[PDB]
Design a protein around this ligand. Structure first.
Ligand SMILES: Nc1ncnc2c1ncn2[C@@H]1O[C@H](COP(=O)(O)OP(=O)(O)OP(=O)(O)O)[C@@H](O)[C@H]1O
Ligand SMILES: Nc1ncnc2c1ncn2[C@@H]1O[C@H](COP(=O)(O)OP(=O)(O)OP(=O)(O)O)[C@@H](O)[C@H]1O
Ligand SMILES: Nc1ncnc2c1ncn2[C@@H]1O[C@H](COP(=O)(O)OP(=O)(O)OP(=O)(O)O)[C@@H](O)[C@H]1O
Ligand SMILES: [Mg+2]
Ligand SMILES: [Mg+2]
Ligand SMILES: [Mg+2]
Lengths: 179, 182, 179
């Protein structure tokens, strides 16, 4: 598993090698970090009551993995994998879950059920990856669809976090000092 | 009620009093505060027992103060009064002395972990400190509510303190760094 | 006592051999090692089974070694002796060889997830790799104990290897990229 070729700080990317602190590798790594959190959250959504959300998450892990591949491409040796079609799929689901969840009355704070809490954490990591992608874009040309996808994904995560709390008979945690 | 507007699909976003790139140090500080807040929210799910009523309510309040920190940090040129005050920082200090007093004597570095609850608080602790580094960067570019830096600095001590109390109440002994002379 | 001294309220803090701003790359590397160590601490709570005493015990040791990594990185101009040596890196290598042998043959690309224990280890893996990127950035500004870079590099491989062994022992298949 270990080749030791990266022991000095450089690593391999599609079409070349770069320093491990290259913004391209930071973006790629944070996408991986975000994908890991979704993997954890998924171990809490295996029940029948969450088949819909769980299957979508499995697919999202593949798409997130594809985002990584699209970003770690110094020399375009292959077309991009992430397409606008995948963003629209996220959009259709977000509309469905916003309809399912109760009306949003107050500002939401991350937390509630264990499952929703983990999804809330994954959401913040996805947002941190988005900032890295924005930085990357400032230096090199990127698959702009990846930025739209990661941007839309945190909204999807926000949507299901609320649906998850609702299904589990737990109210969302709200910003409310009158409570 | 439609979450996505797509206005941020190109990398820019809104802040209080203007628009900036999503990788602006300001948005990063704000985002990391949110990240820290999410870890505290997860940790809380493990602290609803009757043995942690005091800590749970404090974390509940802290989620609000942390959210307020993000609001103060996302304010450009200050169109509204800041929300984070020294009073909230002092409240943190009084609790820390209380928890240090409750926990067994601390004489050396300890491994972060133990109980599931304390482990999560320890992670939240590191994310808060990460947020602190971003706030420090922010302050070098623009004027901020300096109280927010004090609060974030002090909050990680609070988290360190309750993590040890949680393990203690759960009878999980701290593991001291094996470099015994440190 | 007073855990807080308030000397850091203005944005500066001390390292071994001086004081610097908290956003200095040295403090960031140090901080991210602490973050990675904390994630390992959480993962360990999921590996308390009698079937995981070996992995748990090795992770506990790694936590001490991560503290050594932290200390080494905080040393300004070799104010004091470095503690992380090549011996610890090779120790990781031997365990990796053993775990690759234990786990089933790796055929497809793995996505982070599976058993909750493995899922949490995968997350810790990404944080370790994030810590590595900061160390690489630090090394570009100052001379560091190069062995810490090798250790942190090899560490993520160790974590990846035990994640798979953990799923295997729990009789859970690894989540693989497959659509
Ligand atoms: N610290 C890191 N953060 C994010 N991505 C990384 C990091 N290190 C490597 N990668 C990416 O992940 C892939 C595989 O990782 P791996 O650790 O095998 O690379 P390496 O460190 O260069 O090799 P080695 O582990 O043998 O030293 C590489 O193609 C590289 O682009
Ligand atoms: N990636 C990010 N990290 C941290 N904070 C963000 C990020 N994106 C947006 N924000 C902040 O959070 C708030 C709401 O997030 P939201 O995602 O709705 O913004 P946006 O991305 O600009 O809009 P849209 O999602 O419709 O494209 C904004 O006011 C913005 O300042
Ligand atoms: N935000 C941070 N991220 C990473 N490492 C830090 C951070 N703040 C401090 N450190 C490091 O950890 C050590 C102890 O942390 P501590 O918070 O006690 O320092 P401080 O903030 O300077 O002091 P005080 O908390 O009394 O203001 C210091 O030696 C410092 O190098
Ligand atoms: Mg957005
Ligand atoms: Mg401090
Ligand atoms: Mg490596």
């Amino acid at each position: 598993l270990y080749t030791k070729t990266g022991d000095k700080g450089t690593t391999s990317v599609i079409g070349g090698r770069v320093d491990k602190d290259d913004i391209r590798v930071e973006a790629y790594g944070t996408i991986d970090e975000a994908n890991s959190h979704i993997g954890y959250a998924m171990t809490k959504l295996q029940g029948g009551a969450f088949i819909d959300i769980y299957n979508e998450l499995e697919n999202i892990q593949h798409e997130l993995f594809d985002c990584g591949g699209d970003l770690a491409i110094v020399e375009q040796k292959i077309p991009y994998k992430v397409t606008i079609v995948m963003v629209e799929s996220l959009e259709r689901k977000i509309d469905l879950y916003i309809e399912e969840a109760p009306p949003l009355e107050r500002f939401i704070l991350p937390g509630g059920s264990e499952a929703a809490a983990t999804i809330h954490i994954a959401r913040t990591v996805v947002r941190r990856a988005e900032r890295s992608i924005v930085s990357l874009q400032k230096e090199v040309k990127i698959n702009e669809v990846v930025l739209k996808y990661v941007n839309r994904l945190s909204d999807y995560l926000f949507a299901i976090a609320r649906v998850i709390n609702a299904r589990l008979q737990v109210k969302d945690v709200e910003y409310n000092r009158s409570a």
